[PDB]
Amino acid sequence: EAVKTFNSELYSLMDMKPPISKAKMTQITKAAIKAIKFYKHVVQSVEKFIQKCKPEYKVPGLYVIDSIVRQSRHQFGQEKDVFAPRFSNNIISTFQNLYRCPGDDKSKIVRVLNLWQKNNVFKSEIIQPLLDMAAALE
Ligand SMILES: [N+]
Ligand SMILES: [N+]
């Protein structure tokens, strides 16, 4: 039920016109966090969404990752957060999918990466190749 609830909330984005409502992003994040026991399933669902969705939903998909990781780090502690480490496994592939967004959305992705870097959400060994991937598209 926890994962089913999260999946329903996440996939409801495809019925919406971005930018996505703060309240909707909060509901998605809250569902993810309540389902922390099943964090692996939550990560897998978000990655699947990003792989399969229309280009208009790539930035929203990244905002889901960002919102989950930020809330988890706040709520459980940066060292105890299980979400950023799990997202890190497939992150290179995830961003390859994300960069299939419309051209003027690339900057929105880089902004998120810039903020992750400033706040040490991932180490440079993760952040730098993601940044390099943005630079290579141009
Ligand atoms: N966590
Ligand atoms: N945690």
Outline the biggest β-sheet: none
CATH topology: Serine Threonine Protein Phosphatase 5, Tetratricopeptide repeat
Radius of gyration: 14 Å
Class per helix and strand makeup: mainly alpha
CATH architecture: Alpha Horseshoe
Helix content: over 70%
What is the CATH domain class? Mainly Alpha
Strand content: under 5%
Continuous helix count: 8
The end-to-end distance, rounded to whole angstroms, is: 43 Å
Bound molecules: ammonium ion
The shape is globular
Q: How many strand elements?
A: 0
Number of spatially distinct domains:
1
The helix/strand order is HHHHHHHH
Question: How would you portray this structure in words?
Answer:
By secondary structure, the protein is mainly α. The protein has a single domain, classed as Alpha Horseshoe (Serine Threonine Protein Phosphatase 5, Tetratricopeptide repeat). 70% of the residues lie in helices and 0% in strands. The protein is built from eight helices and no strands. The radius of gyration is 14 Å and the shape is globular. The structure holds ammonium ion (2 copies). One ammonium ion binds next to loops. It is found in: Nucleus; Nucleus matrix. Interacts with POLR2A; via C-terminal heptapeptide repeat domain (CTD) phosphorylated at 'Ser-2' and 'Ser-5'. Identified in a complex with CDC5L and other spliceosomal proteins. This is SR-related and CTD-associated factor 8.
Label this structure with key terms.
138 residues, transcription, 0% strand, Serine Threonine Protein Phosphatase 5, Tetratricopeptide repeat, binds ammonium ion
